[PDB]
Amino acid sequence: YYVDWKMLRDVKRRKMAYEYADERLRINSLRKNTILPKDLQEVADEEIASLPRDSCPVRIRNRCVMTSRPRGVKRRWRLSRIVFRHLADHGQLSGVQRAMW
């Protein structure tokens, strides 16, 4: 299994965004311009509204990979502030050490 049901939902959201990445790109290319006449832009808006909900990259939540914490995580290690400390205090993370200055 996964760490949590919300992480199981977030991996599905990321897969759906990876599947619908290019279509949303080509649709946004029709809305983020001013050269095209405004008639087709509303149809492109209805097309992008007809897409599945879990397809937009805004629904993804960068949770921890270890404990699936939605907050307090670092982007470099994808670890929460607690697991990162638990692994850095044991000397299992290279170059990481207590700051003393």
If one asks whether residue 55 binds RNA (CB under 7 A), the answer comes out as no
Q: Which stretch binds RNA (CB under 7 A): 21-29, 30-38, 43-51, 76-84?
A: 76-84
- Name residue 95's amino acid: G
Closer CB to RNA, residue 32 or residue 53?
A: 53
* Through-space distance between the first and last CA atoms of the chain, rounded to whole angstroms: 44
If one asks whether residue 60 binds another protein (CB under 8 A), the answer comes out as yes
Token pair 């049901």 in the structure block, residue? 5
Question: What's phi and psi for 20, nearest 5 deg?
Answer: -95, 25
Among 5, 6, 57, 71, the residue binding another protein under the rule CB under 8 A is 57
How far is it, in rounded angstroms, from Cα 39 to Cα 23? Answer: 20
How far is it, in rounded angstroms, from Cα 25 to Cα 30? Answer: 9
If one asks whether residue 67 binds another protein (CB under 8 A), the answer comes out as no
If one asks whether residue 8 binds RNA (CB under 7 A), the answer comes out as yes
If one asks whether residue 99 binds RNA (CB under 7 A), the answer comes out as yes
If one asks whether residue 58 binds RNA (CB under 7 A), the answer comes out as no
- Nearest distance, CB of residue 74 and RNA, angstroms: 13
Contact 16, 2 (CB under 8 A): no
If one asks whether residue 14 binds another protein (CB under 8 A), the answer comes out as yes
